[PDB]
Amino acid sequence: PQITLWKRPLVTIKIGGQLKEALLDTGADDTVIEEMSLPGRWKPKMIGGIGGFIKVRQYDQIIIEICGHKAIGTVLVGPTPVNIIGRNLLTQIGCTLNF
Amino acid sequence: PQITLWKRPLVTIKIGGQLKEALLDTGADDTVIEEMSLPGRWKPKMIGGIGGFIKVRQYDQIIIEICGHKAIGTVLVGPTPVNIIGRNLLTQIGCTLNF
Ligand SMILES: NC(=O)c1ccc(S(=O)(=O)N(CCCc2ccccc2)[C@H]2CNC[C@@H]2NCc2ccc(C(F)(F)F)cc2)cc1
Ligand SMILES: [Cl-]
Ligand SMILES: [Cl-]
Ligand SMILES: [Cl-]
Fold first, then answer.
1. Where do transmembrane segments lie in this chain (chains A, B)?
2. Would the CB atoms of A2 and B53 count as touching at under 8 Å?
3. Cα gap B15→A30, rounded to integer Å
4. Contacting A residues, span 5-34, partner chain B, CB-CB under 8 Å
5. Contacts of A81 (CB under 8 A, 6+ apart)
6. How far, CA to CA in Å, does A58 sit from each of A64, A85, A89, A90?
7. Which CATH number fits domain A1-99: 3.40.50.1460, 3.40.50.150, 2.60.410.10, 2.40.70.10?
8. Domain ranges for chain B
């Protein structure tokens, strides 16, 4: 698909058996999801930007379905205002910026 | 161009006759630039980031070139981790997400 940017590029994802709405975010290095349970070990991480930093839990080797495309990678879980699909998973679905 | 996301999508912009580096950020509603001098009056704006909300200065109808493409629009000035080209100007230059 081709997604314009007149509004936020929100999509439905499936993660940990749950459906969520998430933002395709080329400015994010990492994928960041609101509080939920995920399998496996985790370690703490701090991520930041405008407004400062938040503490998140880093889970590795997590599968996410995004628009029919399955991708695996690291997912950070914490008090993010919006669910964010970052570059680490955008690459895996072959997402590019074009102009 | 077509820009992949294996690295941060950093490009050169020109604003106020000066070249700067900026991030093409589909997760940003707005364009936010580090402290600099812009012409005209400004208005107050509050934007929310990953870590919380902050105040910035809003300048309208500012001339800016992004990767060689001319745009004219709203530029916010404030304490941003990096210069951010958000959706307001990504749309002007015809930027889409594709996968
Ligand atoms: N309204 C707006 O225009 C707006 C909204 C939010 C932000 S933001 O939170 O600062 N901001 C830009 C931060 C980009 C950046 C930060 C630090 C170093 C390099 C690059 C937002 C907007 N889109 C991307 C970024 N998304 C939040 C975010 C921050 C960090 C990470 C992690 F570190 F994990 F990767 C993931 C997600 C900036 C502008
Ligand atoms: Cl990853
Ligand atoms: Cl003010
Ligand atoms: Cl604008």
1. none
2. no
3. 29
4. 5-6, 8-9, 23-29, 32
5. B48, B50
6. 15, 14, 14, 18
7. 2.40.70.10
8. 1-99
